Coordinates of C-alpha atoms in Angstrom, one line a residue:
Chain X
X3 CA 1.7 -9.0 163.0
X4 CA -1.2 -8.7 160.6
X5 CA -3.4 -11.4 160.7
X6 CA -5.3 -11.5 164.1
X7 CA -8.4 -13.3 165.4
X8 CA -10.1 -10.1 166.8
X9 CA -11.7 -8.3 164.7
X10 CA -13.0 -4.7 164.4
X11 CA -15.4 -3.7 161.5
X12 CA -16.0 0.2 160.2
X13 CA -17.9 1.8 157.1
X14 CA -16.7 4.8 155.6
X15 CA -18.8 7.0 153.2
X16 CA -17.3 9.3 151.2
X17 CA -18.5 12.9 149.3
X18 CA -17.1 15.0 147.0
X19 CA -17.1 18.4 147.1
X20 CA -17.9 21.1 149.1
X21 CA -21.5 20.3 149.4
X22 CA -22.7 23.8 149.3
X23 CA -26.4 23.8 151.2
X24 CA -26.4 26.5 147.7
X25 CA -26.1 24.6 145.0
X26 CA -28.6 24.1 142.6
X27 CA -28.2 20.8 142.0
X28 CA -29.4 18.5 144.6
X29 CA -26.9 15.7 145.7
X30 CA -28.6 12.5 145.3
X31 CA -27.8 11.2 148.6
X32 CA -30.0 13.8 150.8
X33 CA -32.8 12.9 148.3
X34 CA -35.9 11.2 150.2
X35 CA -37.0 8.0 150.0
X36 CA -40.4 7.7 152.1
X37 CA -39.1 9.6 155.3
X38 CA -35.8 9.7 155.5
X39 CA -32.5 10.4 153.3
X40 CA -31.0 7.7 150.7
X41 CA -27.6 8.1 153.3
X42 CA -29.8 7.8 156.2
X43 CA -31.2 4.4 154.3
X44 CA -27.5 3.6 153.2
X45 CA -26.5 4.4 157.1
X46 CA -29.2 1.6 158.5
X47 CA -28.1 -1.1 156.2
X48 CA -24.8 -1.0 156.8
X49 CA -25.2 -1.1 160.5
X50 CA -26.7 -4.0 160.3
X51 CA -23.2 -5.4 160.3
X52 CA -21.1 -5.4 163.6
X53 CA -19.7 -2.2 162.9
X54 CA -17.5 -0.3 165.7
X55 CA -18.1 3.4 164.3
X56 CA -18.5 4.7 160.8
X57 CA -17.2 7.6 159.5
X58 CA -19.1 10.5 157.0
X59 CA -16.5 12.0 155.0
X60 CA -18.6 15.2 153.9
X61 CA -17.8 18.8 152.6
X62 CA -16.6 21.7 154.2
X63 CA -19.8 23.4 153.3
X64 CA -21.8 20.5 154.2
X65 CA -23.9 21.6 157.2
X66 CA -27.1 18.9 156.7
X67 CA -25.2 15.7 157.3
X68 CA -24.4 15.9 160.9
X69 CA -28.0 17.2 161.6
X70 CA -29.4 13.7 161.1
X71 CA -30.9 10.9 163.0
X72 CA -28.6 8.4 161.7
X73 CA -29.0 4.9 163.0
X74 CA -26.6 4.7 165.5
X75 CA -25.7 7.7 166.4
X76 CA -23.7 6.6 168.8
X77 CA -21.4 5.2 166.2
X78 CA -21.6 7.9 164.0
X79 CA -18.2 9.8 163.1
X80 CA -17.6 13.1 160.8
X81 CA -14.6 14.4 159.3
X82 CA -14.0 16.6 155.9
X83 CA -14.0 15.2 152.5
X84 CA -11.8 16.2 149.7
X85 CA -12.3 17.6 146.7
X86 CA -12.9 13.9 145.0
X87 CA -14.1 11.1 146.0
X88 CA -10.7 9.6 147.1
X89 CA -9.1 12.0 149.1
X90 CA -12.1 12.2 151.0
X91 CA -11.7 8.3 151.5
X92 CA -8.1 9.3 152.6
X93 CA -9.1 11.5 154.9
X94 CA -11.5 9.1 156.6
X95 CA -8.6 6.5 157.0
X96 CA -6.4 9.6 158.3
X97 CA -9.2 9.9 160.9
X98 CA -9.8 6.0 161.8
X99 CA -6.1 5.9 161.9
X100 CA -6.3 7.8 165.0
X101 CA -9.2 5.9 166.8
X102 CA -8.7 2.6 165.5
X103 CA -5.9 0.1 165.1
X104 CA -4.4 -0.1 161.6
X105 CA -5.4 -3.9 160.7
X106 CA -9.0 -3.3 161.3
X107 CA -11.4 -3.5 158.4
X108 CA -12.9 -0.9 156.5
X109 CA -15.7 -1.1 154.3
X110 CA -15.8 2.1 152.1
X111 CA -19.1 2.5 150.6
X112 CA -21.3 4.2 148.0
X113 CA -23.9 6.9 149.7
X114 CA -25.7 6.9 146.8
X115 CA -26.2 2.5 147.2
X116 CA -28.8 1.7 150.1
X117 CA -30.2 -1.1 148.2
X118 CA -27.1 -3.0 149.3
X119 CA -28.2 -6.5 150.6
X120 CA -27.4 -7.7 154.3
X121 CA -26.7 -10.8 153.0
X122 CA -24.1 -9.4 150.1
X123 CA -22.7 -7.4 153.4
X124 CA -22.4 -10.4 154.7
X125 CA -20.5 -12.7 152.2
X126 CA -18.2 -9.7 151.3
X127 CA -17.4 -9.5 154.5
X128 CA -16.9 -13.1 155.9
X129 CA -14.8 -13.8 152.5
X130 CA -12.4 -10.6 153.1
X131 CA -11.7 -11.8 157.2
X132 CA -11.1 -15.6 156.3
X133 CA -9.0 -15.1 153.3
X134 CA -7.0 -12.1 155.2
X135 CA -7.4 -10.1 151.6
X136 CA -9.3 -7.0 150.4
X137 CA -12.4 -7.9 148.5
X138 CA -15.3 -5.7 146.7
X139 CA -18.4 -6.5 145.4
X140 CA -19.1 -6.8 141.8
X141 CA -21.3 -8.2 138.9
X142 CA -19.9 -9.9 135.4
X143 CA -20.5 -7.6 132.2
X144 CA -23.2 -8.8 130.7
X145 CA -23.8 -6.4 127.1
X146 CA -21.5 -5.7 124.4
X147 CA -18.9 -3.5 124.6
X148 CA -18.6 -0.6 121.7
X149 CA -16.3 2.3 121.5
X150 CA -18.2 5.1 120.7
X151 CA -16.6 8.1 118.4
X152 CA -17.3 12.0 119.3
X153 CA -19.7 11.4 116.3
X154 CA -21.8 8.7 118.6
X155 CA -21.1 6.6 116.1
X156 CA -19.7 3.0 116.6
X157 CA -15.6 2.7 116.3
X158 CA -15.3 -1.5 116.7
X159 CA -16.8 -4.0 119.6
X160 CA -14.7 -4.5 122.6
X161 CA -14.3 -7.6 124.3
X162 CA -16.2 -8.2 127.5
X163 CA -14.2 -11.6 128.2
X164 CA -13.4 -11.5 132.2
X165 CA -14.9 -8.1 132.5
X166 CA -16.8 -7.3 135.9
X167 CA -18.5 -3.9 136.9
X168 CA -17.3 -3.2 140.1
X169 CA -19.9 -2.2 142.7
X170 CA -19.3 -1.7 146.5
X171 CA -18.7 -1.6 149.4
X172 CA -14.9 -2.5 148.9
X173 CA -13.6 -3.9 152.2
X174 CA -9.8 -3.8 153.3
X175 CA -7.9 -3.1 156.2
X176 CA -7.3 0.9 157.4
X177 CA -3.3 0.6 157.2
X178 CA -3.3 -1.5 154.0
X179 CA -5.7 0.6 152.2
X180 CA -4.5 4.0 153.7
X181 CA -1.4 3.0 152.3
X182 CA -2.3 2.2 148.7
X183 CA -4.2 5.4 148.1
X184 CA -1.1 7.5 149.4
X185 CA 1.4 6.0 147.1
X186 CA -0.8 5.8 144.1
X187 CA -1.8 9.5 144.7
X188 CA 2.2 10.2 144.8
X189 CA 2.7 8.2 142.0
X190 CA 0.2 10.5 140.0
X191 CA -2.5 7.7 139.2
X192 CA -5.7 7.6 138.5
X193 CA -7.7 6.8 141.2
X194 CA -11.4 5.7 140.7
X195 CA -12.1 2.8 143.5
X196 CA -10.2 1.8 146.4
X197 CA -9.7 -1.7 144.1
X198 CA -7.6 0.5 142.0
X199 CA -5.5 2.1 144.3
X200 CA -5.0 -1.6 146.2
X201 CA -4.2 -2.9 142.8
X202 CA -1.5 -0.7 142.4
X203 CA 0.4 -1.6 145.0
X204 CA 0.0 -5.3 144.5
X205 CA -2.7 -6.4 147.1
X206 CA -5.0 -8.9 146.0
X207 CA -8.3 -8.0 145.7
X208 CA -10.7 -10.8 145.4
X209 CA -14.8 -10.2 143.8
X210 CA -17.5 -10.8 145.4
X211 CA -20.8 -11.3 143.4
X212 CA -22.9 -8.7 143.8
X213 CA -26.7 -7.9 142.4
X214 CA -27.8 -6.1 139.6
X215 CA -30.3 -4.6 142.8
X216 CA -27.5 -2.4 144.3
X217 CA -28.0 0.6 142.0
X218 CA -26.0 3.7 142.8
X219 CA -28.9 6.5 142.5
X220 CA -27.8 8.5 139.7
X221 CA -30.8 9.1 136.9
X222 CA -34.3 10.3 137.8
X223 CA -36.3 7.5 138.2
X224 CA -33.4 6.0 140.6
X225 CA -35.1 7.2 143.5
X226 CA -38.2 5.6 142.6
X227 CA -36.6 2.5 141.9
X228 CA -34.6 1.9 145.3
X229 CA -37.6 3.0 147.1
X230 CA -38.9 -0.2 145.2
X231 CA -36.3 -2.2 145.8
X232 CA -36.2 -1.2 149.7
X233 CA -39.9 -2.2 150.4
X234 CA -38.9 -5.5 148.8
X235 CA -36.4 -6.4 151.3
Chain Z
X9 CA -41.5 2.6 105.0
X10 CA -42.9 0.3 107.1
X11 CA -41.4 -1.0 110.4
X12 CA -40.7 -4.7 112.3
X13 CA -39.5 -6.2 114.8
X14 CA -37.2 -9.9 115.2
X15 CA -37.0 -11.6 118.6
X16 CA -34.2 -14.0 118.7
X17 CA -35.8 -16.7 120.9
X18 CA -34.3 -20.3 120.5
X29 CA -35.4 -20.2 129.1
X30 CA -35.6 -16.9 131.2
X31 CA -37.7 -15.4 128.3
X32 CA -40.5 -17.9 129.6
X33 CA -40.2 -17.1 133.3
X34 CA -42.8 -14.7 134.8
X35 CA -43.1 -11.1 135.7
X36 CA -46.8 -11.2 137.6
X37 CA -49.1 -12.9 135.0
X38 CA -47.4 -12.9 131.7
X39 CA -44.2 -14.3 130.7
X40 CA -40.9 -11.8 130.3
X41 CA -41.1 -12.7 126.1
X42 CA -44.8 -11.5 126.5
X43 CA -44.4 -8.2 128.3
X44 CA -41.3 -8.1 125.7
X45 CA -43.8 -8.0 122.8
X46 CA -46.3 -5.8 124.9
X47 CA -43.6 -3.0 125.3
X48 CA -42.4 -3.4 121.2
X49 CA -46.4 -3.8 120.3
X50 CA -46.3 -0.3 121.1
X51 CA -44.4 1.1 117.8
X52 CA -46.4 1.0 114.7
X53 CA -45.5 -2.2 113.6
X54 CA -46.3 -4.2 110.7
X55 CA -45.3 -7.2 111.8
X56 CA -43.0 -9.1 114.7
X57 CA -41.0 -12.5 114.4
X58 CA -40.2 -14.8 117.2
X59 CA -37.2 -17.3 116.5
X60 CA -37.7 -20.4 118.5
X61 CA -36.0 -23.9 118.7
X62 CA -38.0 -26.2 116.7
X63 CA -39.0 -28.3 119.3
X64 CA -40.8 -25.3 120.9
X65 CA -44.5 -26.0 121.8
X66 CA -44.9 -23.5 124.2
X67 CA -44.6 -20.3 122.3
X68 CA -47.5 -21.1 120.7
X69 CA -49.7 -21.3 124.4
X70 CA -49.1 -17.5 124.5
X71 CA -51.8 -14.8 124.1
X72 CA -49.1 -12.3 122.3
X73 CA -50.1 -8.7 122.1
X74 CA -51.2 -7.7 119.0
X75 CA -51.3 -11.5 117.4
X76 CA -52.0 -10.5 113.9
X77 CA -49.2 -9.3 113.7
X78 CA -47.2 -12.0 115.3
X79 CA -44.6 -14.7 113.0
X80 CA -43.0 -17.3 114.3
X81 CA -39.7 -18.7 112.3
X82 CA -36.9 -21.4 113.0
X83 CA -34.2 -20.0 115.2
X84 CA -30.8 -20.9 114.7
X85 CA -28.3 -22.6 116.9
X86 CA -26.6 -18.8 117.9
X87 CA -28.4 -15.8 118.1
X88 CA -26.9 -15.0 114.8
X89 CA -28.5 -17.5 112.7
X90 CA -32.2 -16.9 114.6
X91 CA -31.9 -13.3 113.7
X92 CA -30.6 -14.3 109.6
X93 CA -33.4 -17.0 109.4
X94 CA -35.8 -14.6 111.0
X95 CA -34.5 -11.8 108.1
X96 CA -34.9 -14.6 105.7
X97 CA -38.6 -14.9 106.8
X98 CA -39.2 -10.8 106.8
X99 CA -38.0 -10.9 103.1
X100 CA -40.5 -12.8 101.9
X101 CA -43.4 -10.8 103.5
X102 CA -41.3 -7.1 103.5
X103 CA -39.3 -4.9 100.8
X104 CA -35.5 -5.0 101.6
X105 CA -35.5 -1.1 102.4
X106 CA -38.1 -1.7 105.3
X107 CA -36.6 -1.2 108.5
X108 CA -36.2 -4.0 111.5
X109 CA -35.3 -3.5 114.8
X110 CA -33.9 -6.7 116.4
X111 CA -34.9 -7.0 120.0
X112 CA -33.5 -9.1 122.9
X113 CA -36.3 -11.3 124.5
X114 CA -35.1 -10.6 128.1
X115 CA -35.4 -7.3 127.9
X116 CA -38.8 -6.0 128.5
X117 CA -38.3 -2.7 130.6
X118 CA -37.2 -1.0 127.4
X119 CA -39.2 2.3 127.2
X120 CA -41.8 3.2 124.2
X121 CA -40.0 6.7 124.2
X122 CA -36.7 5.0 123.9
X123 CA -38.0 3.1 121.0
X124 CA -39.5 6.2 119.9
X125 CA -36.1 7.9 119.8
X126 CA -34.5 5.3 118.3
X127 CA -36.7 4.4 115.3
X128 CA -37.0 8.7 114.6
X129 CA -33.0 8.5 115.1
X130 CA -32.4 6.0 112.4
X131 CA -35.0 7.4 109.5
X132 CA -33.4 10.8 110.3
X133 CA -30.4 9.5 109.7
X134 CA -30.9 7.1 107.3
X135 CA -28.6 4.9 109.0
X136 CA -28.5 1.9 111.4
X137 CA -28.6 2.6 115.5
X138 CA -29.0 1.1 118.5
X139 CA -29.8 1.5 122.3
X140 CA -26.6 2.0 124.3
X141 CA -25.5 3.6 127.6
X142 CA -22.1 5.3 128.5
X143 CA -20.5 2.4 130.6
X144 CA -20.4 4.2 134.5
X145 CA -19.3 1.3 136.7
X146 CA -15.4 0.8 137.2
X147 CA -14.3 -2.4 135.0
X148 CA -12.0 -5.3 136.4
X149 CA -10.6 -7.6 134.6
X150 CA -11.0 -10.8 136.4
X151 CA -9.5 -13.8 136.7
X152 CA -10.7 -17.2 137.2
X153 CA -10.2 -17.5 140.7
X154 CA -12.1 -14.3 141.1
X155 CA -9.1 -12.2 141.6
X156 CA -8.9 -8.7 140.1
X157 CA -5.9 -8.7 137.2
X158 CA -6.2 -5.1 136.7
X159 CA -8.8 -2.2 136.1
X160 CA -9.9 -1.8 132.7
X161 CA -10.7 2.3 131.2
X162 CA -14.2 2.6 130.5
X163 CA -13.3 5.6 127.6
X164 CA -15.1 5.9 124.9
X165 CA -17.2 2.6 126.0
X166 CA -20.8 1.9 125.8
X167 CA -23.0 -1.0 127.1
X168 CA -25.1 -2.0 123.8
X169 CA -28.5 -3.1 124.6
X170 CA -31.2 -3.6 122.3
X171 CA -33.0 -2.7 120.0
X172 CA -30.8 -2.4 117.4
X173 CA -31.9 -1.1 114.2
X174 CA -31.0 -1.8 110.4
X175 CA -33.0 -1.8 107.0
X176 CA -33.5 -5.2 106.0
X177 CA -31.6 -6.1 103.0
X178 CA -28.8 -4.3 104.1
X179 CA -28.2 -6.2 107.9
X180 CA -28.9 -9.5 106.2
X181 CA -25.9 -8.8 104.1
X182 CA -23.9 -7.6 106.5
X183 CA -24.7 -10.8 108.9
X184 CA -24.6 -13.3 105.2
X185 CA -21.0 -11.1 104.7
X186 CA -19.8 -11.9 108.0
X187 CA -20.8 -15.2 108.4
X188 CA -19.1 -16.3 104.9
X189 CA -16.0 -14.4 106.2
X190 CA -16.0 -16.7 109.4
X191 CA -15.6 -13.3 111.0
X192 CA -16.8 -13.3 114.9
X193 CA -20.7 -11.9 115.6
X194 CA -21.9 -10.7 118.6
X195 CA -24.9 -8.3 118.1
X196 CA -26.4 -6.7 115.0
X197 CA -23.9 -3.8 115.6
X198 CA -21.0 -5.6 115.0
X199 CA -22.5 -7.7 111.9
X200 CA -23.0 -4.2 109.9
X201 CA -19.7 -3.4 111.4
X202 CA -17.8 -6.1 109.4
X203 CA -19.2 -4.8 105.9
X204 CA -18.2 -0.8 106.9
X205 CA -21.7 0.3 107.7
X206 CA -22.1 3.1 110.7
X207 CA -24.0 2.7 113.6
X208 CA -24.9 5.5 115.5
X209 CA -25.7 5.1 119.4
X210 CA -28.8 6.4 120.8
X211 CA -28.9 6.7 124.4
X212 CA -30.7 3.7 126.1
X213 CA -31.5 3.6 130.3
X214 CA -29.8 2.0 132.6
X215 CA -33.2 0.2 133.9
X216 CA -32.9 -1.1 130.2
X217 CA -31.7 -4.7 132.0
X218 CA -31.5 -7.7 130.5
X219 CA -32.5 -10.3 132.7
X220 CA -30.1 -12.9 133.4
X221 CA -30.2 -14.4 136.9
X222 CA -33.0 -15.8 138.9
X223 CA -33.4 -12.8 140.7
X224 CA -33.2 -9.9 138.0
X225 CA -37.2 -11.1 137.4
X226 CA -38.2 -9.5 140.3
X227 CA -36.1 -6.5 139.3
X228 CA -37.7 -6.3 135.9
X229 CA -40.6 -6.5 138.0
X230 CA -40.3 -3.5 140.4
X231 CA -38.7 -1.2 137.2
X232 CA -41.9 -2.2 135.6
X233 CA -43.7 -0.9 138.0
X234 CA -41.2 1.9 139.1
X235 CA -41.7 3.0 135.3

C-alpha cells in the first residue's frame, strides 16, 4: 500500500564533486550572504516546512559542510555525493532508504536556490501529498527560442509553445524516485533533474508555478541579487 | 552612422519601479547610447505616454503601433525612414525590459558595426525544459542544445530589417522577434551574450524584481 494519511517530509541537497577545500574555484554554495552560507540560507528555508531530517549529499573531500550551524541541526543528515549531481541524489535516497520508510516524500533541492519562497514550499508540497504524484516547481518560457551555430550565429527560431523552465525543489516519494534514477541510470540515460528520471519510467509529474525570484546562484552578481531578494522576504 | 532605438509599446510597461514607470527607466537605461533619436509605438488611443518626463526628450518620437508587435516595430521603421538614411542602425528594444546593462548595449552596438551584420542579446538557455501539457503535467523533457533565450535589443540597419519584416509579412510567413524577421530573407544574426538579470517583466511580482536587480546592479 502506497497511498497513506501519515506523512513524513525530507529535503535532500545534492553536490557534485569532490569539493576539494583546494580548488580554486569557489563553489557558489559556501559563498556568504550577510553572515552565513547561501546552503546555510537554503537549509533555514527549507525547514521551515515540517521536515523529519534532511540529508547533505556532499563530496568526499568536502570537509566545510558538516562544520556548520545549520538550522536544525538536529535534523541534519550527511552522506557522500557522487561524481554528478544525480548519483549524489541516489546516494541520499540509498541513505533515507535506511532511516525512513520508502513512501515518504522527498523534496530534492537546489543548494545554490535559497531564495525559494515558503509559500512555493508550500503549494508544491500540499499539491504533490493530495494528488499522491511527484511535482516540481517551474516557470513558463517566456523569450524566443534560437538555435545558435558554433559560429554564434542564428540557425532558425524554436518553438516555445508548452515549454516550462524547470526550477526546484522536485518533490516525490524516496521508493518511487529511488527507483526511477536506478533504472534510467541502467538504461544509460541522460539524467539532468529527478523530473527526468521520474519521466522515464512513466510517473506523472505535475508543475507547480514557480517565481522568476528563485534564482540558482550561478553568475557574479547572483550573490548580490539573492542577498536582495532575501531581505525582501 | 548614426544610431536609434524603436520601443514597440501598443500595460506592465506603465507599472512602477519606485518613481518612474518601467517604459521610463526603459528609455533611461537605452538614453545611455549615443542616440540620435528613440521611437515609442503606442495604441492610438494612448494619452498617457505623453504625461511622461522621458529621458532625454529631444530625442524622443512617438508613432502609431500596430495591432502585433510586428507591425509597431514596421510602422515605427516607417517613421525612422523619413527622419534617418536606410544604412543607419536601430536597435529594437522591448519595453519591459529595463535591467538591460549600458555595457551590454555597449557590446552589442560595437558587435554589430564590427561585424557589419545584425545581432542581438541572448543567453545560453540553463534551466531544464518540460514540455507541458494543459493540465500542467510534464509530456517530456525537452534538450536545451544549441538553444538560446533571445532578449532584446536586437539590432539591424534600417532599410535592411524593414525589408526583411515587409518580406515576411507579404510571405504570410510567422514573426516572432526582429531575429526571425531577418531570418525569413537569409540575413545572419549573430548572438551576443545578454544576462540573465536581463528579465522581462511579465507578472505582477517580476516589478519588484526588476526593482531589487536595479538596485543589485
Amino acid at each position: 500500500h502506497h497511498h497513506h494519511h501519515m506523512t513524513k517530509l525530507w529535503a535532500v541537497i545534492p553536490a557534485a564533486g569532490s569539493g576539494s577545500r583546494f580548488s580554486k574555484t569557489e563553489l557558489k554554495q559556501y559563498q556568504y550572504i550577510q553572515d552565513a552560507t547561501v546552503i546555510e540560507h537554503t537549509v533555514k528555508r527549507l525547514s521551515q516546512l515540517p521536515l523529519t531530517g534532511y540529508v547533505l549529499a556532499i563530496g568526499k573531500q568536502d570537509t566545510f559542510a558538516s562544520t556548520l550551524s545549520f538550522q536544525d541541526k538536529h535534523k541534519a543528515h550527511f552522506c557522500n555525493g557522487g561524481v554528478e549531481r544525480v548519483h549524489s541524489v541516489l546516494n541520499a535516497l540509498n541513505y533515507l532508504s535506511q532511516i525512513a520508510d520508502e513512501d515518504d516524500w522527498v523534496l530534492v533541492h537546489d543548494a545554490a536556490r535559497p531564495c525559494v519562497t515558503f509559500e512555493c514550499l508550500n503549494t508544491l508540497v500540499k499539491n504533490a501529498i493530495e494528488t499522491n504524484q511527484s511535482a516540481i516547481l517551474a516557470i513558463p518560457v517566456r523569450d524566443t527560442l534560437k538555435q545558435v551555430n558554433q559560429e554564434q550565429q542564428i540557425d532558425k527560431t524554436v518553438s516555445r509553445e508548452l515549454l516550462w523552465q524547470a526550477q526546484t525543489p522536485q518533490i516525490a516519494k524516496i521508493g518511487i524516485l529511488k527507483k526511477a534514477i536506478e533504472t534510467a541510470l541502467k538504461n544509460n540515460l541522460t539524467i539532468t533533474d529527478e523530473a527526468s528520471a521520474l519521466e522515464s519510467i512513466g510517473e506523472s509529474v505535475q508543475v507547480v508555478m514557480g517565481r522568476s525570484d528563485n534564482i540558482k546562484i550561478t553568475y557574479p552578481d547572483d550573490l548580490e541579487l539573492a542577498r536582495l531578494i532575501l531581505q525582501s522576504q
